[PDB]
Amino acid sequence: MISDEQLNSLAITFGIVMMTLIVIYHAVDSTMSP
Amino acid sequence: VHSHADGTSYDEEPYKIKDKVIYSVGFSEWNGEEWLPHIADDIQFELRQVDPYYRLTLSPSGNDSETQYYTTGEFILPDRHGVFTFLTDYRKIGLSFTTDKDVKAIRHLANDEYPRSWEISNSWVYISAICGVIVAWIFFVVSFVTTSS
Amino acid sequence: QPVSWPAFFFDTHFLIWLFPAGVFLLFLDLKDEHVFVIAYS
Amino acid sequence: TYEQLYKEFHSSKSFQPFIHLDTQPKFAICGLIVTLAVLSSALFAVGSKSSYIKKLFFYTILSVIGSLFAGLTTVFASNSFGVYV
Amino acid sequence: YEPPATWENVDYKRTIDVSNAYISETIEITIKNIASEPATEYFTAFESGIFSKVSFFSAYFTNEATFLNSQLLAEIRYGIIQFPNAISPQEEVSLVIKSFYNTVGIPYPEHVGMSEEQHLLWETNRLPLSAYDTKKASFTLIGSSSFEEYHPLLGKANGNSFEFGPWEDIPRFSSNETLAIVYSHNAPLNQVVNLRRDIWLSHWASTIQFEEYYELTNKAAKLSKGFSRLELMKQIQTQNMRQTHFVTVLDMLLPEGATDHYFTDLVGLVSTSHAERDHFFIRPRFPIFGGWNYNFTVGWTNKLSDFLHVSSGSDEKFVASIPILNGPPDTVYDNVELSVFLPEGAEIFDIDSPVPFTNVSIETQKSYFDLNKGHVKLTFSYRNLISQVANGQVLIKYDYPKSSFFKKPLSIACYIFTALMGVFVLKTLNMNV
Amino acid sequence: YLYLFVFHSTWVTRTAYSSPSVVLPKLALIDDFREAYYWLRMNSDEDSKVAAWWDYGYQIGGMADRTTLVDNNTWNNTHIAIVGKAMASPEEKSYEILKEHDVDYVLVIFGGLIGFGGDDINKFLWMIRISEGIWPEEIKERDFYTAEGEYRVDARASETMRNSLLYKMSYKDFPQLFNGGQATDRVRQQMITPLDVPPLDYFDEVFTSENWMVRIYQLKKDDAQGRTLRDVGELTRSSTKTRRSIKRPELGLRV
Amino acid sequence: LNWFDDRTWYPLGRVTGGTLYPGLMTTSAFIWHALRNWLGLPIDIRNVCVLFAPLFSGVTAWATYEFTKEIKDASAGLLAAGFIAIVPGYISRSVAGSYDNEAIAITLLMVTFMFWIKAQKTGSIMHATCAALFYFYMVSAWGGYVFITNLIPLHVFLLILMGRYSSKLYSAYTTWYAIGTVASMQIPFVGFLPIR
Amino acid sequence: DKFGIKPEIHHIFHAEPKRVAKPIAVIFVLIIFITILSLIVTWLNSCAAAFNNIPTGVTAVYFLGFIATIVGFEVIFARYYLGTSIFETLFSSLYLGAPGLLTSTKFLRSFG
Ligand SMILES: *[C@@H]1O[C@H](CO)[C@@H](O[C@@H]2O[C@H](CO)[C@@H](O[C@@H]3O[C@H](CO[C@H]4O[C@H](CO)[C@@H](O)[C@H](O)[C@@H]4O)[C@@H](O)[C@H](O[C@H]4O[C@H](CO)[C@@H](O)[C@H](O)[C@@H]4O[C@H]4O[C@H](CO)[C@@H](O)[C@H](O)[C@@H]4O[C@H]4O[C@H](CO)[C@@H](O)[C@H](O)[C@@H]4O)[C@@H]3O)[C@H](O)[C@H]2NC(C)=O)[C@H](O)[C@H]1NC(C)=O
Ligand SMILES: CCCCC/C=C/C/C=C/CCCCCCCC(=O)O[C@H](COC(=O)CCCCCCCCCCCCCCC)COP(=O)([O-])OCC[N+](C)(C)C
Ligand SMILES: CCCCC/C=C/C/C=C\CCCCCCCC(=O)O[C@H](COC(=O)CCCCCCCCCCCCCCC)COP(=O)([O-])OCC[N+](C)(C)C
Ligand SMILES: CCCCC/C=C\C/C=C\CCCCCCCC(=O)O[C@H](COC(=O)CCCCCCCCCCCCCCC)COP(=O)([O-])OCC[N+](C)(C)C
Ligand SMILES: CCCCC/C=C\C/C=C\CCCCCCCC(=O)O[C@H](COC(=O)CCCCCCCCCCCCCCC)COP(=O)([O-])OCC[N+](C)(C)C
Ligand SMILES: *[C@@H]1O[C@H](CO)[C@@H](O[C@@H]2O[C@H](CO)[C@@H](O[C@@H]3O[C@H](CO)[C@@H](O)[C@H](O)[C@@H]3O)[C@H](O)[C@H]2NC(C)=O)[C@H](O)[C@H]1NC(C)=O
Ligand SMILES: *[C@@H]1O[C@H](CO)[C@@H](O[C@@H]2O[C@H](CO)[C@@H](O)[C@H](O)[C@H]2NC(C)=O)[C@H](O)[C@H]1NC(C)=O
Ligand SMILES: *[C@@H]1O[C@H](CO)[C@@H](O)[C@H](O)[C@H]1NC(C)=O
Ligand SMILES: [Mn+2]
């Protein structure tokens, strides 16, 4: 199966990707919409 | 053996509170060569949780070739649910001692087993009112759509 | 059983201080939903 | 008969898997992307505001491919995750 | 019943090896013919009790490895041996009749301490109880370090053997005498009351998954004065590699190249398991003492390439040889249910089992991603199987056309396509007011 | 700050809120609860009743699958009090109270061998306090403390603590574990000797886990000749020295 | 619903029917049955109960997004969903294996507050009815439903003191109350308490 | 006397709650019946709810469907009140609301 340090890396990667997509979305929406 | 008033065994229909039940046992006496019916008049059956809820003297009711059969009447189980014990303890000084105990579970009334609304003369009013309101709503929707302002 | 202060930081990081600030900003516009939010808070 | 079968069972031909299990993960991933691409286009087709006929003839033809890929992708992903089909 | 008395035994060498947890009996005979008719069959007499529990019955000529046809019938019972060359009115032919009985002797004191050695009491017949008049006969016990008759036609020990011979002629059906003997045993004496094997074959992943569920119990001498954890730890502390009659570790022997082992219980999994070199050591949660139960599960996976061969007649016709047992080295099974699960599209074509079964069934049972109809499930039932003696491979020929191979992704895609069409319908419908 | 929050969150959930409950993790795994519950499940009668503190009722009933007496959803305090008064009274009163409720086994938790800390002896005082509000004239909480006011499990302990049921049912055979009889508790940090623990005359020990964490005893059936189990015990135990003189037993009138 | 187990509180017994919130077990059984019949996956029931909280934490995330898209904007809803997805204060009680009332409840709380805010700021009767339905779904899952029944009135009450009464308020609140209060008395456990 | 005959014991049940005499509960049912009749007469004869503006074109085949939906739901509930299971009620509601929703949203769209 998958070990623990791998699931930790996976959780952290999911979180980072989520928070980066959220920041990009907010920037796009705030710059291109009054 | 114990069962419903009408013979329906326990496994067929588990017990509940205030359900008529009957209990029966048989006693035989050995006298050296063969068994015969044992005739006694002081035997007691007890239905108890931790304390005796029912204590009834068994009365002779039927016979046979080798045993004598005793039975309580058609007593009504109590109105308290729980895991009860039907026990017959025959301990007469001089004779052999005999214990027969069965641990059953007396259930509570299910949401289905309650006198319906039409069976209670006190609730004819409320059901009549519900029906009246539903029929007035049904006529109001129709008369609200059909007619124009 | 009251809780001490470190637990509030333990359970929410960087979001404990922003919570009062957001209640304030939500108390500057004061729309109808914001009253529900403030009461909850 | 048991002996006739036991002798039949010793035929030099042995089972050879269609797609090796070691390379089933990869396929899955690949399939996944396609399953996500084409399918998504179909969903966007709805709401085009074109004729009903065009939006149906396009939705069905895009789903008859999204499905066909998604079935294989599901089989491969199940096999790769340890739950064999 | 009484069979024809057309055979006169001139020798009867009956040996009984009590070494393991089952009785292994061997009868060497040099039968001769009396009645003047060419005959081709021979009867062997078993009692009622022991006949109820017989796990293996083989016969063969002493000259070579020719296994003569031998079948148990279907109030002493009989087994029948059939010859291929009917013997002449006067002929002498030697034979070896091997049998395995699930019975074993009962603990004699019944209650014995954690460290005392245990004795077993086993009672059988002494004089040869056969369906014919024998001229010579013997009897020998082997497999225990100490033999002792119970309430004594007496035996003279020879090392670890206990030979007593009623050599002189004996009238047939001599069943009056019973012989009870106590021997010493120092093995766990474990028995599986129920086994539920399950072999799942998969063509897509090309794998065969085995999963077994064992209801085990040690039927050795019970533990007197309850179970004391302190006494156990003390024994572990000093008694290094000392033979015992409780189960500490089991050694499952799996097929070559197994992978993804797992050992589970009915309360989660167990972490005391170790798989090395086609071997799997499993330690139960608690040491199974005499009279204790333990129900558990074992599982593993193998390559389907070395269990499924493709018929050269038609490219879409498969044969499978699947083992009957894979478990502890010296165990006894009172019930086996071997289920084989073939893919959603198979069609059984032929079936063969090396040992007789009690019931064979074919059904379907749905599993993960089985939409139309479940896997084909073929179940064999067995009654008295012994670990090392019940060797054999069930053979199953079946069909699996490419059109059934590709029907699984097609079914999944049909489900997804119907879902999409329904979403489209409900998304292109005006429900506004 | 957002990325730091992600990292902090992952760390906190991996370190503080991801610890199992049935297995207890130098740094080895302790699976005594599942071991004892499974023993109960497989080597006991299917209609047996288990009597234990109310904290474990849901696992004793969910993993062992046996009838219990008290659960975690304490809805009848008087039943939890009956069950607490039977783990604090002399062995005879405990036998009576338990048998009257048809109890079959008794399960105690002992963490004095590996420093568990949440064992039964630690929550004993609550068993005393809950069973004191209903029978204030039988179980007195000030009788388990020493003459000074200390809760001691040592030799200096009160005779009431020494004679209670939980004490002699948890510390049975513990002194004779370590050679010399100098067994040292690890939760209370006190030395126990073989004399501190009186024998059990009414209960048999049927199971003790590998780390002595869970102990399961069984009520023995009343004597056939109808005498007190304590007299049976004293007869088998102190047999080498008996009163060989004949003296009128000074009984009362036979009815 | 008419269960009576004799394997607990041995002599007395437990009726269970009137001392249990049948909202989590019902959802678990429904998901189990659906996976078993409509999807072809005969997943075990222990895996449907161990992975219940993780599966419903993304439903709590979407509920938070929808609730925050009504207060400010979609971007704030995305931010709030991202926050509540992994915040430890929720993970403590939503970890895999924690098969308790809270896992489901704290999702239904947000699903109910999103409909109460849609109804309170739109005046719709349909959204007030959805709010009442999910409120009933919550009284039957968690004993902390007493939060909603005391926080939705307060809101309205406050809006009355601030002089912000409007027909939308009347419509929303009277629909929510009328429906939810009569539907919350049908749960055997909570019966006749709302009036007394 | 510890061993010997013992006195009997019979449980004591409570008296079930009393139900009002029947002739006192039929009068109120009659009052409610007369009240509903009077309501229907008040609508029918106060110049309100007069049955005009009845659709008769193609939209009439939709108006009947609208009525069919409403009355059919009240029939399902009736059946349920009389003993029908809850799952059968859910399935009946599904089957009757699938086309009823369409027919009753089309009626409202056609009726301005
Ligand atoms: C939570 O758990 C706890 C612990 O498990 C539960 O607590 C137990 O509850 C029991 C009942 O709820 C209770 O049992 C009753 O105790 C009463 C108190 O008696 C005490 O005082 C007397 C002296 O007066 C002592 O002798 C006795 O030992 C006690 O110390 C008893 O009075 C009750 O006896 C009656 O019931 C039993 C069994 O039902 C009969 O055997 C007995 O003969 C009594 O029966 C009379 O009453 C019943 C109806 O109640 C009649 O059916 C019957 O025919 C008898 O009727 C006569 O008397 C009545 C007046 O009582 C009269 O009107 C009639 O005409 C007749 O003359 C009974 O023994 C336990 O003591 C109690 N235990 C503890 C430790 O607290 C608690 O219930 C649980 N809570 C739940 C489940 O919600
Ligand atoms: C929109 C959703 C899209 C998908 C997103 C989520 C999926 C990713 C999941 C990641 C890992 C999951 C697998 C866990 C690891 C093994 C679990 C296990 O081993 O447990 C299994 C349970 O198996 C499952 O049911 C898992 C299902 C497999 C998941 C594959 C993903 C595809 C899903 C797409 C669904 C499309 C539906 C189409 C409609 C028909 C228990 O096996 P067993 O005890 O029977 O032993 C088996 C041994 N015999 C057979 C011998 C007894
Ligand atoms: C509207 C939906 C449309 C799409 C439909 C698709 C739905 C999802 C389908 C498949 C996804 C996986 C479903 C559960 C499979 C893991 C079972 C398990 O628990 O496996 C656990 C392993 O833990 C895991 O890896 C957990 C990670 C994987 C699950 C998380 C991803 C999906 C979560 C959302 C779905 C949850 C649905 C059930 C709960 C409500 C082992 O189980 P075991 O102890 O029996 O060992 C079985 C193997 N031995 C016996 C051989 C040892
Ligand atoms: C709404 C959408 C939500 C999306 C997110 C939801 C869930 C994901 C979050 C967390 C997942 C937890 C991961 C647990 C994994 C434990 C099992 C494990 O460890 O598997 C790993 C293997 O992995 C893999 O290489 C799998 C690679 C395949 C990539 C995934 C394919 C896409 C599936 C998703 C879409 C499915 C349907 C598509 C069309 C509808 C170990 O396998 P093994 O050695 O145990 O057995 C296998 C035995 N052999 C090795 C012999 C085979
Ligand atoms: C546009 C048309 C809309 C139609 C209305 C639609 C929905 C109504 C909205 C709310 C209804 C509130 C009243 C609840 C009554 C339930 C019926 C019932 O629980 O069954 C009851 C069982 O009694 C009970 O214990 C009620 C206890 C309530 C427990 C319910 C568990 C909570 C579940 C929460 C949601 C779970 C969803 C899972 C999947 C997401 C009767 O069942 P029976 O088979 O015995 O029949 C009996 C026929 N007698 C009545 C005439 C005899
Ligand atoms: C683990 O496997 C053992 C081995 O089969 C199971 O033992 C069996 O348990 C059942 C019920 O617990 C016994 O049935 C009983 O039969 C007696 C007649 O002897 C009857 O009077 C009882 O009312 C009951 O029906 C069965 O005899 C017993 N088998 C043996 C060989 O002892 C055990 O149940 C399994 N445990 C689990 C948790 O799966
Ligand atoms: C052989 O097949 C099965 C073995 O389980 C048995 O027959 C069926 O047994 C099931 C009970 O598991 C019944 O529900 C079925 O009605 C039985 N018959 C069929 C046709 O399925 C039985 O042991 C054997 N059946 C025989 C000899 O006919
Ligand atoms: C029942 O009747 C009497 C009992 O006094 C006696 O004949 C015998 O016990 C029984 N007779 C029959 C025919 O059952
Ligand atoms: Mn809880």
Numbering used by the authors:
A (entry chain B): 1 to 34
B (entry chain G): 270 to 418
C (entry chain A): 352 to 392
D (entry chain C): 2 to 86
E (entry chain E): 25 to 98, 111 to 188, 194 to 474
F (entry chain A): 458 to 482, 489 to 718
G (entry chain A): 67 to 262
H (entry chain F): 173 to 284
From the article:
Oligosaccharyltransferase (OST) is the central enzyme of N-linked protein glycosylation. It catalyzes the transfer of a pre-assembled glycan, GlcNAc2Man9Glc3, from a dolichyl-pyrophosphate donor to acceptor sites in secretory proteins in the lumen of the endoplasmic reticulum. Subcomplex I contains OST1 and OST5; subcomplex II contains OST3 (or OST6), STT3, and OST4; and subcomplex III contains OST2, WBP1, and SWP1.
We identified two distinct functional states of OST in this sample: A binary complex containing bound LLO (resolved at 3.0 Å resolution) and a ternary complex containing both donor and acceptor substrates (resolved at 3.1 Å resolution). In the structure containing Dol20-PP-GlcNAc2Man9Glc3, we observed well-defined EM density covering the catalytically important divalent ion Mn2+, the four isoprenyl units of Dol20, the pyrophosphate group, and the entire A-branch glycan, which includes two GlcNAc units at the reducing end, four mannose units, and the three terminal glucoses. Close to the active site, Tyr521 and Asn536 form hydrogen bonds with the N-acetyl group of the first GlcNAc, while Thr537 interacts with the second GlcNAc unit. At the non-reducing end, the terminal Glc3 are accommodated in a binding pocket formed by the auxiliary subunits OST2 and WBP1. Binding of LLO to an apo-state of OST leads to the formation of an “LLO-primed” state, where EL5 and TM9 remain unengaged and allowing access of a glycosylation sequon to the active site.
